[PDB]
Amino acid sequence: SRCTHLENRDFVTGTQGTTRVTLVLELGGCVTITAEGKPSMDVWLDAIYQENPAQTREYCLHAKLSDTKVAARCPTMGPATLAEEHQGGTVCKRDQSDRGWGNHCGLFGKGSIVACVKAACEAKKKATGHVYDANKIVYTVKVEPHTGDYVAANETHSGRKTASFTVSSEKTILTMGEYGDVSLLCRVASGVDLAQTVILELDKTVEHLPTAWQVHRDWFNDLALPWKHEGARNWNNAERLVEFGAPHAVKMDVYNLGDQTGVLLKALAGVPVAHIEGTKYHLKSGHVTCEVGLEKLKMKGLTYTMCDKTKFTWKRAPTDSGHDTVVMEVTFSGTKPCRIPVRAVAHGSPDVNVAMLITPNPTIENNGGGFIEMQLPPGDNIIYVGELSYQWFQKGSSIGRVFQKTKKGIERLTVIGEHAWDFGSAGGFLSSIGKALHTVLGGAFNSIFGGVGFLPKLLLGVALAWLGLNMRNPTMSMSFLLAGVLVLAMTL
Amino acid sequence: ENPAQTREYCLHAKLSDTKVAARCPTMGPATLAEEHQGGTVCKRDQSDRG
Amino acid sequence: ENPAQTREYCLHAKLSDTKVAARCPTMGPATLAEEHQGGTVCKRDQSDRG
Amino acid sequence: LELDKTVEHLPTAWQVHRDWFNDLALPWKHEGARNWNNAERLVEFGAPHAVKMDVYNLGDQTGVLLKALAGVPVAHIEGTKYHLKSGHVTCEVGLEKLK
Amino acid sequence: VLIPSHAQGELTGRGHKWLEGDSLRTHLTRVEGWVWKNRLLALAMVTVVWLTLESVVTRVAVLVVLLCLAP
Amino acid sequence: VLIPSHAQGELTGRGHKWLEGDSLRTHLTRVEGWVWKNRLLALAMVTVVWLTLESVVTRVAVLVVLLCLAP
Amino acid sequence: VLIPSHAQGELTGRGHKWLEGDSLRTHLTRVEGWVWKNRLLALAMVTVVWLTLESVVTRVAVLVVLLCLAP
Ligand SMILES: *[C@@H]1O[C@H](CO)[C@@H](O)[C@H](O)[C@H]1NC(C)=O
């Protein structure tokens, strides 16, 4: 399973009476779905990219100065015209030096002087911004069932089907081998906010750098560097990298501000990275809402039997997942294939099996089977696999795991979670009331401030909270109550 | 004329022979021969082993 | 039956190959090849160069 | 924790706690790791006089560890099995087939 | 040349990201740079607490502000 | 990773310097960063003045400080 | 059976004792051992100051005890 290759793993159970479930497929999580009477599925978003989209303003971080000429004149001898002023990608600045007779004048005073350069750029020193067109954007969702085989990260899984979701193809069916079909409907428009996202790009051929980044729109449109387009020859505002010193009556010296790469890299603290696999410009973080239909699925191994009790041996040690499940792998060298007798009693009653399974109906195939995963209540637990058993203590608490689900219910509610309340499925007065409370909330609160940052958020929140104490009208003292929201909410 | 030069500094870094080793939690945490060599930058961390 | 081990701790240390170097105050402060060899403990300090 | 078991007049294994174990400021390493991590603890320095600072060898720690220390338990080794001497385990005992 | 940081956006992130562990702690090293290297002026800040108008709420709202003024 | 500026140093000068008409005005252009990008906050600091404070002398000490604190 | 340390004879100081002032700050770095490793207790010693004592001058000796006393 791919969900056992990473940290962020969120279980979403499937009740009987509700078989079409809406998810949120973030990028960097893996949602395991366990439907009763249906094969449990692992669903995750794989990649978000676009095959060579449009690009915006580029920025040159290292100005290539060339053809540096200075015109100077005696104070009343005609402020000198220069032909170099009238091309683009040229920077000029008028100034009043003090001509002497050390440079062969007739009078003294404010000698007029002007210098000019041709502000070119250095090779592969462009800060290329990109934008998204949803015509070529692809959301890739790979789904892997629990076939009983475990597959590594460097390996590939044979039954791992892959669904691409453009905005044009928003309804996709995937035959999951013998398990059946899964119906997937992902709305690309109701996902990553593509409008306020700039993909920045430096030299991708430099080895030890992130290839692309994922920065803000109005942040990017107000940088203070030289800026050209795709295929532009002239520059605009190139006097930002070019700073003129004070002259000494003949040569006003011109100074480059060198490379500004690390300057920009200090401005990317808290950015999500973005991979570039040549053509594609991948994102590494995002979100989308999909719908998972499991009515066209069914189990595998219902016309088989329960296995032997004896021929199970531990290939693999039952250990905790870090997400309160116990994984294993058996070596069954007998009557294949068959339903593995997986059962796990508790402490206090050895009668009742309490093995909340994650791989339902495990079968040791003629070339497959073995991987079993189960969730258990706290306490001592004897996980039987036939005659073969295993002493286990579930280390999580009873209220601790429910509180862990609340912890996920807190830390999921960052800016990803501001759009994402589809962790449930058609709640009516539960889910849609969450949208009713939070869509206007996050919709207005991100609109205000323009995005301002943790320091000014935890400054201005405390500022308005201090202004709450100095309040004229107690009926209008709910501005303090507004200020209280402006401290605690935006600390994620 | 040619005074005694103090601390030099490096502004643009040259990075090569990138060597990474990882271990399990309780199977002898990761070491390298280049951890203790000169001109080498290392940082010990903990992964999430599946 | 022989569990895994964790950190081992040397009780009685052993020192050898001790190399000492100093420099004048403004004549390029001291270095050694054993400043960045494995299992080598060093300390930079200010002496009083007469 | 295990010191030299070949020393005849000592215990063989011991039993101590992990938190204090990571609070040990002795130089440490792992299985196969050649050099000692935080080796500046059994090695200290002094003040020179313009030429030679003498990096002093500092010696042994068999006493500070085990001999001036207030209320810690022990264990045992017999060959290739690291025994214990303290312990507890919950067992259910069904006498139903006895007579 | 000016660039403000991407502290304004801080848009998403559940994959790989930059130095957010030491992004807010840039300033926490700067202000401690104002403390550990200007110890005389750091002890000059005590002359506002127990000598000037020490109104309870407006002590810290002057102190931390004045410490974080110096860039 | 941070190099502090020569806001601190400021030794001497009758020769030539880098940016003497911009060192003081880098921060002023940054204030324009917290105004032009944040015109809604330019309106949000108005309600600080006439609806909350009623403390005419200390109003400037609120406004200017809350702008300059924004880095 | 322990051997006490010789901190009750200090004889001279012109040659070379083992450790200079750092050995005098063993019980001033172990106190930071009390601070950084017991943040629960480090915050628990604040409720003694401003809720139970009300004895501003004599609070200093109370802050020294229960931190520097125990090893
Ligand atoms: C995957 O990595 C493991 C770890 O060393 C290795 O044993 C295995 O052969 C690798 N498989 C592939 C296909 O790279």
Side-chain angles (χ1 to χ4, degrees), chain A residues 26 196 210 213 215-216 219 224 240 257 263 267-269 271-273 285 411-412 414-416 451-455 466, chain E residues 1-20 23-24 26-27 30 57-58 61 65:
Chain A
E26 74 203 359
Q196 305 297 112
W213 299 260
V215 308
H216 182 266
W219 172 68
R240 293 164 174 176
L257 292 181
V263 174
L268 304 171
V271 178
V273 304
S285 195
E411 74 188 341
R412 287 183 71 75
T414 177
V415 186
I416 296 104
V452 77
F454 289 113
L455 290 181
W466 174 63
Chain E
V1 177
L2 286 308
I3 40 94
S5 73
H6 183 71
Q8 291 177 31
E10 297 178 347
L11 299 177
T12 61
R14 295 205 207 284
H16 294 291
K17 287 175 262 70
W18 262 73
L19 284 56
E20 65 267 15
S23 66
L24 296 184
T26 54
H27 293 277
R30 291 179 179 181
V57 179
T58 67
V65 164

Side-chain angles (χ1 to χ4, degrees), chain G residues 49-62:
Chain G
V49 182
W50 290 102
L51 301 169
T52 61
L53 287 172
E54 296 185 343
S55 66
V56 174
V57 177
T58 64
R59 298 180 178 174
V60 181
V62 180

Side-chain angles (χ1 to χ4, degrees), chain A residues 135-388:
Chain A
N135 292 315
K136 313 181 189 178
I137 196 177
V138 178
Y139 293 171
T140 298
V141 171
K142 291 189 189 278
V143 180
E144 171 173 4
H146 295 161
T147 61
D149 277 341
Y150 181 76
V151 167
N154 61 4
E155 299 286 337
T156 54
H157 182 269
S158 62
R160 181 182 298 162
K161 304 304 181 203
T162 305
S164 297
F165 291 101
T166 68
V167 75
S168 64
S169 183
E170 73 196 326
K171 200 175 189 182
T172 306
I173 308 300
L174 296 181
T175 305
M176 310 314 292
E178 298 194 339
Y179 291 92
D181 302 330
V182 65
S183 65
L184 304 174
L185 190 153
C186 300
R187 291 188 189 77
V188 177
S190 68
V192 178
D193 180 79
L194 310 179
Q196 305 297 112
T197 300
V198 164
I199 303 311
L200 188 50
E201 177 186 7
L202 290 181
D203 191 3
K204 72 196 173 183
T205 67
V206 172
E207 190 177 0
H208 293 289
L209 279 179
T211 64
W213 299 260
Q214 179 178 3
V215 308
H216 182 266
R217 179 182 193 75
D218 298 332
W219 172 68
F220 185 74
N221 302 122
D222 299 327
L223 303 178
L225 297 158
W227 54 304
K228 73 172 176 71
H229 282 288
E230 181 172 355
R233 183 62 179 179
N234 294 321
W235 293 92
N236 297 118
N237 299 116
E239 67 278 8
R240 293 164 174 176
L241 286 184
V242 178
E243 294 298 326
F244 296 91
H248 50 88
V250 283
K251 295 161 185 172
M252 192 167 71
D253 295 328
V254 183
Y255 299 116
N256 190 0
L257 292 181
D259 192 5
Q260 303 292 310
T261 295
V263 174
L264 181 61
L265 295 171
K266 286 304 309 300
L268 304 171
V271 178
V273 304
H275 182 73
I276 296 169
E277 187 62 31
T279 64
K280 301 179 184 179
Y281 294 166
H282 297 278
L283 287 182
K284 301 305 299 184
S285 195
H287 59 279
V288 72
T289 68
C290 296
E291 294 180 353
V292 178
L294 309 168
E295 74 279 13
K296 306 294 190 181
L297 286 175
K298 58 210 166 190
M299 295 181 169
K300 196 263 183 65
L302 303 173
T303 61
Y304 304 150
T305 55
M306 304 299 289
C307 299
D308 186 9
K309 290 190 167 286
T310 311
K311 286 178 169 290
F312 291 105
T313 59
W314 296 119
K315 193 186 287 295
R316 180 171 165 180
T319 180
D320 204 353
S321 66
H323 301 85
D324 303 318
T325 50
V326 181
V327 298
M328 58 191 59
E329 182 176 6
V330 300
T331 309
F332 182 75
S333 65
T335 59
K336 291 189 286 297
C338 55
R339 297 183 279 186
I340 297 170
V342 179
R343 60 192 187 85
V345 302
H347 193 279
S349 293
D351 294 333
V352 180
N353 189 12
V354 295
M356 297 174 279
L357 291 169
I358 308 299
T359 297
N361 196 9
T363 58
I364 307 297
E365 298 299 318
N366 298 116
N367 60 346
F371 182 72
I372 301 165
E373 186 179 351
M374 70 200 71
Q375 186 169 9
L376 288 179
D380 296 324
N381 292 313
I382 300 95
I383 301 167
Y384 300 93
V385 179
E387 286 202 326
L388 183 64

Side-chain angles (χ1 to χ4, degrees), chain E residues 25-48:
Chain E
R25 301 186 180 183
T26 54
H27 293 277
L28 297 171
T29 55
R30 291 179 179 181
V31 181
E32 293 179 353
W34 293 96
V35 174
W36 289 97
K37 302 173 191 170
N38 299 315
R39 296 198 199 183
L40 298 173
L41 298 172
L43 294 172
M45 296 298 293
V46 186
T47 64
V48 189

